[PDB]
Amino acid sequence: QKINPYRSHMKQKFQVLWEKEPCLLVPEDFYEETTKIEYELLSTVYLDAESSPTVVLHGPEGIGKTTFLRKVMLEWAKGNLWRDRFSFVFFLTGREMNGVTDMSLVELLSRDWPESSEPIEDIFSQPERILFILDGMEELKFDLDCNADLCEDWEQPQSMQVVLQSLLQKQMLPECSLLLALSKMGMRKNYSLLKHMKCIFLLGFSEHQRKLYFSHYFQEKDASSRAFSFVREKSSLFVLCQSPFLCWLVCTSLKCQLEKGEDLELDSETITGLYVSFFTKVFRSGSETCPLKQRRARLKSLCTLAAEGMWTCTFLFCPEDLRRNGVSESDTSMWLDMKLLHRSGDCLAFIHTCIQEFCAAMFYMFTRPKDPPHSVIGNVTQLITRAVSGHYSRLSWTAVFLFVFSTERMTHRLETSFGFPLSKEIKQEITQSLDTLSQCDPNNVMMSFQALFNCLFETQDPEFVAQVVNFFKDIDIYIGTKEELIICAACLRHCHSLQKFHLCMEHVFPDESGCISNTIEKLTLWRDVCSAFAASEDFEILNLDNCRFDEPSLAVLCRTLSQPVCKLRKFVCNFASNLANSLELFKVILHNPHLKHLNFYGSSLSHMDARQLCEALKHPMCNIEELMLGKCDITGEACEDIASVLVHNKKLNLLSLCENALKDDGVLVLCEALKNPDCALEALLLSHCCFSSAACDHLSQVLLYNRSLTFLDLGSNVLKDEGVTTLCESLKHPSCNLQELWLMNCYFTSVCCVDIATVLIHSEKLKTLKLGNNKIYDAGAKQLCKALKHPKCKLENLGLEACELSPASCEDLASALTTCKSLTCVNLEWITLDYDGAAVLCEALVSLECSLQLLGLNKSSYDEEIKMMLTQVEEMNPNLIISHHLWTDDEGRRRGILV
Amino acid sequence: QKINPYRSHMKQKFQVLWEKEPCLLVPEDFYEETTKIEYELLSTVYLDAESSPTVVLHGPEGIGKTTFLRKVMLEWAKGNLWRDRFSFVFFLTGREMNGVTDMSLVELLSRDWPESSEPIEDIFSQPERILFILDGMEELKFDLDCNADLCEDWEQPQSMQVVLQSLLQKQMLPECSLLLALSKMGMRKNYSLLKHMKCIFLLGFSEHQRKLYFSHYFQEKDASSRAFSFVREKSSLFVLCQSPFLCWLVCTSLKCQLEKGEDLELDSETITGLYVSFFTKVFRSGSETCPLKQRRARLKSLCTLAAEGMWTCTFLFCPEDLRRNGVSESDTSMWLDMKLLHRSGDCLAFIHTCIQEFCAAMFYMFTRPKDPPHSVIGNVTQLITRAVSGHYSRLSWTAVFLFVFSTERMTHRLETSFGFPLSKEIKQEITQSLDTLSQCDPNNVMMSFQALFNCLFETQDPEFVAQVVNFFKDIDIYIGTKEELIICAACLRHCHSLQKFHLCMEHVFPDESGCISNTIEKLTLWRDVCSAFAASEDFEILNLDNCRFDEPSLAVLCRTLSQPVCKLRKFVCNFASNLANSLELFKVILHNPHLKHLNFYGSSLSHMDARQLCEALKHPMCNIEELMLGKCDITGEACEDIASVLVHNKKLNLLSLCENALKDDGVLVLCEALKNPDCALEALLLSHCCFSSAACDHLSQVLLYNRSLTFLDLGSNVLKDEGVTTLCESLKHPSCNLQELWLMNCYFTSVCCVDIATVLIHSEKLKTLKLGNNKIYDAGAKQLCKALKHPKCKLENLGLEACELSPASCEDLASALTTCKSLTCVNLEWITLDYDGAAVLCEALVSLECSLQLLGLNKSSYDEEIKMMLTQVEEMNPNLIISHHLWTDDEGRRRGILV
Ligand SMILES: Nc1ncnc2c1ncn2[C@@H]1O[C@H](COP(=O)(O)OP(=O)(O)O)[C@@H](O)[C@H]1O
Ligand SMILES: Nc1ncnc2c1ncn2[C@@H]1O[C@H](COP(=O)(O)OP(=O)(O)O)[C@@H](O)[C@H]1O
Question: A GO term (biological process) for this protein (chains A, B)?
Fold first, then answer.
């Protein structure tokens, strides 16, 4: 074996770690039996020396991930693993790293690197010979994202977050290999960050392995047989015993019950029940020579220790910390003996992070509603808020425990088992906290309804679940497993408060011959979820984002929405249309007179699909007033059918066909439908429809003959001034009812600006004009400003944003703002400014004659002097807002593009 | 609505049916509430008047399928449904149909058709106006398959099975519509038969509907509240109450418990537990003023009635039937009062088929091992065999019940509740019956391991399950759901008796980024199933038939097969090969020295996939002696690697590369590999490899230089006479070691027959030659016969099948058979014969000089005189077997095509 001092140092260090850290040391042959498959998988998956992947050790908490990583490193350091694949392996743990504030990868590695050896840069000469093991990533004080930039230099000092994110995204030592340990929650959290992923699942014990674990814990035989028989007779307990840590919990609980002499009782209704039984019986069997008052004081001090640790993302407790939280030497000895704490060096740690979270939740059970703030540990409202708001999701398990503790049954269990009283105001605290969150603005909060639903589900309190869920009106949820379907059905079964529902569902209804695959249980759960749609008589918006149905599930949803009791108003079905989908959605459209807005943005339709859609719309039970079909792959032939709808449904008044390819023959057919002075359509959006000036002829005949059409969007079309001139000739006559015109990015120039200037003088009805993103090069600007100076131009909103404007237009713009009394909004973003033009513009802006309410300008993108001038403008005209990105979101929403 | 007398007749019929059949008549508004979605879905899905679809009413037993179909027919006949879509709907029920033995569709329809109405041909004039409702298909005396042909004429008399299967496959009135009622078992049974399926699932009650049903059954309020509270406190009972029939069972059980006055106790461990509680409590509450002897005799008589009904597929009981089984008027009144039976006209029927199956299973509890045969009711051995043999699978639920009854706990429960003794030899009867079944030939007695596993699973007896499953050595199983995975894991956890395992697995491991999708539970179950492969030190053959894995499940399987304790010998992986499949399957190949046969037939490979396969095969831990790569999309370039294998692996001696496209350059490279007098390959099959005479040159150099190669298959290649003559030139020299040559379907003719005729005279080692399916005429046959008459021709097997042979060859054939003393097998199928040549052939065949053991000929395809002559031949030469399809299955198996 090659001489290596670092390898031997790690051998000694992890040999010592392997023998005293775990809850119970089992014979090594047993451990090797229990994890044989995973060890072999790892050893062969890394022998690759095209690229090397990052392998994630996947499993639930307490399954033994950290133990497996330590065994792997110990076997490598002894020379028994990766002998000819990795020369150096580094073991990084999250809690030890959290202490590091500002360090480079080299310094962190140097921490455990003996000087009497090779240098670190020399070992970095060959990066593929390095493996990084990252254990306890979920215990980090920061999140991992691509938000922060990622440097590629190991020598250069950086914050530890940047080092980890660079290592993970492979922008730092790309040749090295990564070994991650993640739970299901961590897997879902960091799936986006990880690429080229390879997974190894830990499986825990089998039934024979559970028997052997019991035989190893109980050094006798007959009581071991008794305990195994008792746990086997109960199904849920045996199922939970697959996890070695839960198995050890059950062992210690039963061992206390047996050494006490009591009969074998155990609670396995929930995981929280097993935790409560373990903690209860260890406390009773480990504290008997102590009076009740000091028992309560000691437990409360320990729980405060855990709560402070969890709120500061700390899991190692120096003696000074125990003294601060009121934990004395006697208390430390007692908890070490009863095996809720163990040493992790010179410091102490909880036997497992889950036990620490248990005590942290327990801490709130000693509290009063009118308690002074701890200034470190947040109160119940803060904990609930941080746990059900998606940004952090750090104190999740704690909150879950607290939810379960707040039930009357479990508060009773806790009080009876401990012997002292505990707070019963905690359910009310949680309820009021969730109500307060619900009454907040849904956009500013970003609720995580998966987290809230999990917490509610664990209480098994249907009335509590109904009360809490009915506080919320705008709900969004992802369903991709049966577990999440069960939880969502439980939480929404008795929900009658829905306003907006956003749903994404995958992996549940495959429709691979849905007859054989779908089950009555799945349909019943789905029907229960749908019951909220028809039971909530406040239901405005249903947004189905990339959902995957089969015929029965879709039929259930459509029949739910068809019921006359349903009050749906907006149906937003993104990217979904087939033959049976057509049939069922047409049942939806027909049956409901309350449904008025329909947005199919993105769903690629065919000729027959559009034919069937229009045939369903022509039914006289259809009250659709807004129809958005953007990016539906609609073409000219389908226009033949759409025109038909315009003839029949006098209730329809807004139609958007953006991002399609009408190609002037569809526009011809649509103008043929529109010309008839029976079509009641009031708003038309044909943005980016790949048509030209040829259609502007026919559209002109529309403008003369429609007394209902008031809004036209023709942006992103090649009009080349002939189309704009034809339309302007049509719009010269005041009898036209057009109010709003959008011709942005239409590839015209100054030449047609004269004709526009004519309509501005003759129209008494055109109030909003967007001519932005066109190269008017100050000639069009000068002509339009002179037109606006006319004492008959009733124009209210003008957009010339990003029009190749220069400081020469300023003066002429400055004179329009002070003369057009009806002009209240002007978009001039991306104009290039100097001092001599910014001064004139600001003089205009601060004037009483200037009747402008909204100015579109990008203040940040200028020098300091002009920034100071615009700030002075803001402080001298208290009615004017200067801002950029004025109309982007409004344009997207009205076109139907965003949603 | 059009006037119709048939409609009114069906209205009266189903109106009478609707009011007396059900267990409890609920208000009609309640029923319509409980089935609103399904009714609307049917009504709107059929209004479409393109092909006609088959609509299936899907749900578990007792969910209300028959009730829903009857209400649908009543509403149709009342004019409230399908008023403008169907003119005539026929309601076919299995039990009523079973009485018909041999009748046509017209007569069966006329059965319930009044004469004073329209004619049958006139109503068949427009088939589009016809709907068929098929209820109780699982209660048929015959099975439904596609084996029998399907005629399109309704007038022609046929057996009812043929009419029904033609109706289902739409080869009889294809324009008609179908409405089927099926269970999960029936759905999986008949999925193959049905096409264009449409499904409507019945959902049963919701929670509020369960409350309302309780309030409706219990006409008071306080016990309704008490019953609902008790059922709600128990999870399993509430879950089971979703089914209306199970809900009525629970209602009656609780009603007996309350009117008796006892506390509310109920066992809900299994569905069989609920049935036992219902039956026990109904019997106790309905026969208490009766002495024990007559209680037991009455229950036994009812059980006998049920048993005769189940074994004769009868479910309506005329009074003579009750008298024959010993059921009197007093007994009928008692059972009607306790609501185990109800009237269905002048006759009685069991309240539900499930109750009848329950009683039929109960009947065996009154029997003795040494009992005389009932001559109608089969004994326990016959019942178990018919239940776990796939051919019948009719009495499944009965057997399931009997299994649960046979446990000690449930026998104790039944004895305690009833009060009289019951048989305790039934576990032994079933175990011995299954042992005897296992010792039968696995090819004949078609076990249905899904049925056996379900029966074993329901007993919840791990020891009994292990004992029964270890009786079987050859197991084949399909896993397509999580339920079936759980069942197979439970049954195979402690199985260590495996010899051959055939597996087809779908729909469980999607590999849609298996990290997020796969769960530890599923992986654990799969590992438990795989544990049988490595725990059974007799494991010969593992056949994965079109299985679909992800990385973790495949890795679990491969690591299982890698263990040195594993004794795998034959690995048949049909239709699976990718890059990750490559890595893991190479772990399988490398690790195991016991593995010797490898068949990848059907798995589409690529250039690099074949490269990686060959590189894995070149490892020196590889003991493969047989390699089958038929229909693997292998081409000439991959031969370069394949040739390498032939050079390296001195253990390999059989290679089959059939159904590939080698195209003479691959064959060139392979012959370059074979020429080397180190290649130990002994048998090569290049059938259907798309090569020509150009390869026969190189193959010739093979036969001179390979002292180990003894079998060559070159069938179905365009070899013409030049290739065969080149090969014969190579094989003339006695130094060639070739023992078997297959040149069937090789497009040669009489011209090369001279050279073959030379080799037959000069070879001392060529024992089997197949020249079938080649257009050698009687001239070639005569030349070969003259060769065989030479006193040096040591040819043992000759195939001249399908060679355009005529009665002129007979004489020359007849004289070769009596001269070639070494010629023991000759295939002459498809030869045309007359009397004067058949006589010569038979005179040869019945002769002492004829040393033939096997003659390949199709006796059935000749006139009566020649048939009688060949029958006399068989009756005069007791050593000669005449048969057709002589070598087809052997050819397929040896090429690796079949399996
Ligand atoms: N295979 C095993 N055999 C015996 N004990 C185990 C095994 N796996 C885990 N344990 C015990 O369970 C605990 C698992 O905790 P840990 O190893 O931190 O897993 P995780 O990080 O997944 O929670 C350890 O304290 C160890 O004592
Ligand atoms: N929707 C329902 N509402 C109330 N009771 C029902 C309903 N469906 C079925 N039942 C009851 O359940 C029992 C079983 O009915 P059945 O239609 O025979 O089930 P299946 O057709 O599945 O065998 C009947 O006695 C009936 O009274």
Answer: regulation of inflammatory response
Distance CA A338, CA B535 (A): 41
CB B187 within 8 A of CB A504: no
Go through chain B and tell me how many residues it has: 899
Residue B112 CA to residue B742 CA, distance in Å, equals 64
Q: What is the rounded end-to-end Cα distance, in angstroms, of chain A? A: 63
Residue B283 to chain A, least CA–CA distance (Å): 30
Integer-rounded Cα radius of gyration of chain A: 35
CA trace torsion B766, B769, B774, B779 (10° rounding)? 70
Burial B250-284 (b: 16+ CB within 10 A, else e): bbbbbbbbbeeeeebebebebbbbbbbbbbbbbbb
Cβ(A769)–Cβ(A762) under 8 Å?
Answer: no
Q: Residue positions of A in the annotated binding site for ATP?
A: 59-66
Technique behind this structure?
Answer: X-ray
Is residue A66 within 6 Å of ligand 1 at its C-beta?
A: yes
Partnered with residue B171 across adjacent β-strands are none
When CB atoms are compared, the residue of A37, A242, A555 closest to B559 is: A37
**CB-CB contact of A772 with A802 (8 Å):** yes
Hey, of A43, A182, A184, A199, which one would you mutate to test binding to chain B, going by the most B CBs within 10 A of its CB?
A199
Q: List, as one string, the DSSP characters of B191-244.
A: TTT--SEEEEE-----HHHHHHHHHHHSSSSHHHHHHHHHHHHSHHHHHHTTSH
What's the resolution in A?
A: 2.8
| Beta-bridge mates of residue A711 | A683, A740
With helix as H, strand as E and coil as C, how does A80-137 read? CCCCCCCCEEEEEEHHHHHCCCECCHHHHHHHCCCCCCCCHHHHHCCHHHEEEEEECH
Residues of A in contact with B185 (CB under 8 A): none
CB B556 within 8 A of CB A34: no
User: What span, in angstroms and rounded, lies between the C-alpha atoms of B443 and B422?
Assistant: 37
Are A706 and A646 in contact by the 8 Å Cβ rule? The answer is no
Domains present along chain A, CATH in parentheses: 5-201 (3.40.50.300), 453-895 (3.80.10.10)
Of A456, A478, A458, A476, nearest in space to A467 by CA: A456
Nearest atom within ligand 1 for CA of residue A245: 12
Give residues 239 to 298 of B whose Cβ lies within 8 Å of A. 242
Residue B475, phi then psi, degrees to nearest 5: -125, 135
Give Cα separations from A417 to A213, A284, A367 (angstroms): 28, 8, 19
Give yes or no for a contact between B455 and B431, defined as CB atoms under 8 angstroms apart: no
Give the residue among A691, A656, A662, A727 at the shortest CA–CA distance from A891.
Answer: A656
Nearest to B133 by CA among B191, B172, B104, B176: B176
Burial string for B546-560 (b: 16+ CB within 10 Å, else e) reads ebbbbbbbbbbbbbb
Q: Do A37 and B528 touch (CB under 8 A)?
A: no
SS3 per residue for B350-398: ECCHHHHHHHHHHHHHHCCCCCCCCCCCCCHHHHHHHHHECCCCCCHHH
Strand partners, B825: B797, B854
Distance CA A258, CA A847 (A): 89
Q: Which residues of B touch A41 (CB under 8 A)?
A: 555, 559
**Minimal CA–CA distance to B40: which of A555, A586, A592, A531?**
A555
Cβ atoms of residues A391 and A446 within 8 Å: yes
Residue identified by tokens 């179950």 is B525
CA distance A546 to A479: 12
Structure tokens at B339: 């609501």
Chain A residue with minimal CA distance to B480?
A517
Q: At how many degrees (to 10) do helices A636-648 and A665-675 cross?
A: 10
> Residues, chain A, total?
899
